[PDB]
Design a protein around this ligand. Sequence first.
Ligand SMILES: *[C@@H]1O[C@H](CO)[C@@H](O)[C@H](O)[C@H]1NC(C)=O
Ligand SMILES: *[C@@H]1O[C@H](CO)[C@@H](O)[C@H](O)[C@H]1NC(C)=O
Ligand SMILES: *[C@@H]1O[C@H](CO)[C@@H](O)[C@H](O)[C@H]1NC(C)=O
Lengths: 50, 50
Amino acid sequence: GYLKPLTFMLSYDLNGTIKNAVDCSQDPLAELKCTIKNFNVSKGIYQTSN
Amino acid sequence: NQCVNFNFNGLKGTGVLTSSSKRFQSFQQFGRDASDFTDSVRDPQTLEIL
Ligand SMILES: *[C@@H]1O[C@H](CO)[C@@H](O)[C@H](O)[C@H]1NC(C)=O
Ligand SMILES: *[C@@H]1O[C@H](CO)[C@@H](O)[C@H](O)[C@H]1NC(C)=O
Ligand SMILES: *[C@@H]1O[C@H](CO)[C@@H](O)[C@H](O)[C@H]1NC(C)=O
């Protein structure tokens, strides 16, 4: 596979290891997660960045 | 237990005493935290962490 210039959101645990990631350009839900910078989203309507 | 100025390859002047320092993995020297405040640095030759 080939790499592309993309924006990613990364998480670190208590041991300093990467445990989760989100590709912000995949789906509108990932765009919403990357806009508010959280892996959990509450109920509502939000404006998202491009 | 005094207001010192340590040079652990980097300069900063604060106080010092003995640390438990659980979170030291992958050849680490200084245990920084959020807002980049410095705490929990180790002696560069020994393994004790202040
Ligand atoms: C963090 O590392 C320690 C090392 O002993 C391990 O026991 C512990 O399970 C790790 N924590 C997680 C959440 O994996
Ligand atoms: C957030 O989402 C993760 C993944 O589904 C879930 O395991 C976790 O319980 C959620 N956290 C909160 C605070 O609800
Ligand atoms: C480094 O050398 C000093 C003496 O200059 C000694 O006290 C110390 O134990 C040494 N550390 C190691 C890891 O050999």
